[PDB]
Amino acid sequence: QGLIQQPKIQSVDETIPTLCDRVENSTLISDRRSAVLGLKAFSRQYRESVIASGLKPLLNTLKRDYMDEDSVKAILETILILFIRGDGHDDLTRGWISQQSRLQNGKYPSPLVMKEQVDQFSLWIADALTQSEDLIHLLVEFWEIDNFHIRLYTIQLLEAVMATRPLKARSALISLPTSISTMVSLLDDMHEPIRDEAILLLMAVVNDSPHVQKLVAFENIFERLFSIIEEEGGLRGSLVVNDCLSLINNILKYNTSNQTLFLETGNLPKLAHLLSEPISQDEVFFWNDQRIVNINTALDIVSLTVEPGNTVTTKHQNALLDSSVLMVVLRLAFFHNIPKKVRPVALLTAANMVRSNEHAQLEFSKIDVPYFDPSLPVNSTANGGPIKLIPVVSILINWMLYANSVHTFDTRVACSRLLKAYFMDNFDLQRDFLLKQVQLCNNSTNNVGDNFKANLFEVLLNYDAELNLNPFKLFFTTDIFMFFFQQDHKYSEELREITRNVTTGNDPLKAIQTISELLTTSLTAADIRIPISYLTFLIYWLFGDFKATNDFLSDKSVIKSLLSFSYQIQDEDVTIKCLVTMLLGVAYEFSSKESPFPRKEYFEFITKTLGKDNYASRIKQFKKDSYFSKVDMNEDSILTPELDETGLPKVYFSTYFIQLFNENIYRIRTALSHDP
């Protein structure tokens, strides 16, 4: 309504104020209503004029005309228009409102949504609606009106104020009892867009609010959200499923009671059913960014319930084990048709499920995964069955060690973290694993050794000429053995001793001397990872282990090579040079009178050649001026690391080595000093 050229000065001074007057004062709803539509037209051009002039009248006429549907509807449209000037195509900025309820409160397909807008004018409207506890209560009462647009416009307006003044709006909404129950009931609304919009407002309201988390939980919401998810096609739903999952996430995050509620009320079978969607003989599940995000959000919900350090973790872990969830997430980890971004997430979810739980770990050790066909399989029974069952632990070790090219580094470190979750705080399972692993090595060195791969001893004690093409294979191997060797670990001595007393044939010969030969041979290797892995391993092994120091010292030829190697041009290989130096120092510190290279003989041999100053210097130089110096002191931020020209992660040091060095840096540096 109007014309094209209307000078601002007449509109502000004469028309809007007159219309504001008519909205509040006309004694005929008909003319009040009509004044609102007059304001609604000016709201597109003269937003702020109408906010200043129009707002209090609009809100006053809204409390008066609240039983009149056309009156309520026209005022709600007008406020929504006023909320933002806005770049986009909708004057009511409803797209912006939904996007704020998602981005502010959930994790959405980042690629698929590459998108301040809120003014002093927004905040004016937001405070006008917020100061008034009664206006909030009025809006809530509008959900009883039998009008689609009013119910939707009310949800949207509340989303707008929750995106601008959440604490006041959340405060007001809680004050009305019955308020949440009503919101949850919008999920049953006959009209789909009210159901959809209500998931977004629920996300906004329960976010960072334990009070609302418990309030929403008591409204039987899990049952509702899971029917919407199955009704929209599960993982193959798009945003509504993301919203449903995102809302399930916000109701459980940091709410143990809500978590134990979710598990005990028959949700697991539902979550399992949804997680299990991508695995069918029938179709080839179609993967895109939305379905990746849906499943990962689903996996995250499993993870929440079993966050380590909470008192309920064991309970939750045990609960998840008493369903199909573990088996289903391990299918997602191992199945062929699974995106790279999903595999690691499934692997670390399983790791949270089993970490430090005998019952979870002992069940884990019995899980087998179906595989298809070998060489020369006649499908007929007489030849056999083309299906083979492989133990999950074997696949982890295989993927960890030999799955370069086909699997991402992230999957390989997830495999490493799941294995550590499996062995965590379970000495018996650690011992049985190593003992089984040494048998298999003795078939590769004795029975058929001299006339798929999952053996750590094979890697640690054999020479691979092409190791430079898969350096991380060695890095993982040393990192698992250091993990086992932890001094602070219960009965680590037994595990050290089993690894020490292994004999081989390569390049009979015990583990520490075989690794020594492998080390010295490695000082000339393309990848500096290879030498760092052996060096840090042996330093770790020798540190506080007299029998390991004696095995090392029992071969003067190796100490000669290491001393020779330590003499390099001042800039050439300062990291190897210091690690070699550190090895000899540490070997000195746990040398005794009856070490095969006697202490005082080995002391003279090291001190005369290198010097008490040059040693201490090269320990100090290792901390401050080597590869070691620039490592982030993160226990679990080796996932998604920085890359090389070659394309290799910038990962050199196992965390156990870093912890050992940092915790005894003084003792290392002063090994040659003072001691006899």
Strands 368-372 and 509-510: unpaired
| 521 domain-assigned | yes
Cα maximum dimension of the chain: 110
Measure Cα distances from 601 to 125, 544, 565, 607 in Å: 85, 20, 20, 10
How far apart are the C-alpha atoms of 549 and 475, rounded to whole Å?
A: 22
Question: Nearest-CA neighbor of 523 among 489, 475, 572, 556?
Answer: 572
Q: Are strands 387-391 and 368-372 parallel, antiparallel or unpaired?
A: antiparallel
Count of alpha carbons within 13 angstroms of residue 648, beta-carbon side? 15
Query: Distance (Å, rounded) from C-alpha 228 to C-alpha 232?
Result: 6
In a domain, 245, yes or no: no
Distance of CA 210 to the CA centre of its chain: 23
| Rg, the chain, Cα only | 34
Is 30 within a domain? no
Q: What is the CATH number of the domain that holds 624?
A: 1.25.10.10
3-state DSSP call for residue 140?
A: helix
Do 222 and 248 form a contact (C-beta atoms < 8 A)?
Answer: yes
* Residue 537 maps to a domain: yes
Q: Is residue 263 part of a domain?
A: no
DSSP per-residue codes, 546-585: HHHHHHHHT-HHHHHHHHHHH---TTS-HHHHHHHHHHHH
Q: Indicate the SS3 state at residue 189.
A: coil
Cα 65 → chain centroid: 51
**The two structure tokens encoding residue 129:** 């609606």
- Break the chain down into helix, strand, coil percent, rounded to 5: 65, 0, 30
Strand partners of residue 372: 387
- How far is the C-alpha of 485 from the C-alpha of 500, rounded, in Å? 11
Residue 430 lies in a domain: no
Residue 161, CB-side half-sphere exposure with 13 Å CA sphere: 26
Residue 54 exposed, middle or buried by CB count within 10 Å (0-12, 13-18, 19+):
buried
Q: Is residue 524 part of a domain?
A: yes
Q: Which two tokens stand for residue 540?
A: 């770790």
Alpha helices, H only, 374-408: 392-402
> Which of helix, strand or coil describes residue 369?
strand
Tell me whether residue 557 is in a domain: yes
Contact yes or no for 242/290 (Cβ under 8 A): yes
Report the C-alpha gap between 220 and 265 in whole angstroms: 9
Helix 239-252 with 94-103: angle, nearest 10 deg: 40
Q: Tokens 């996932």 sit at which residue? A: 639
Angle of CA points 130, 135, 137, to nearest 5° = 105
Eight-class DSSP state of 390: E
Burial profile 176-203: b = 16 or more Cβ within 10 angstroms, e = fewer: beebbebbbebbebeeeebbbbbbbbbb
Q: Which amino acid is at 537?
A: F
Cα(416)–Cα(422) distance, rounded to whole angstroms? 10
Give the whole-angstrom CA distance, residue 200 versus residue 352: 29
The dihedrals phi and psi of 586, each to the nearest 5 degrees, come to -60, -45
Angle at CA of residue 630, ends 624 and 634, nearest 5°: 120
Query: What is the distance between the alpha carbons of residues 56 and 124, in angstroms, rounded to a whole number?
Result: 11
Please answer whether residues 239 and 98 qualify as being in contact, where contact means their C-beta atoms are separated by less than 8 angstroms. Answer: no
For 409-434, b/e burial (b = at least 16 CB within 10 A) is: bbbbbbbbbbbebbbbebeebbeebb
Overall number of domains in the chain: 1
* Structure determined by: X-ray
Residue 653 domain boundaries: 456-669
* Cα angle, residue 442 at apex, residues 441 and 446 outer, rounded to 5°: 130
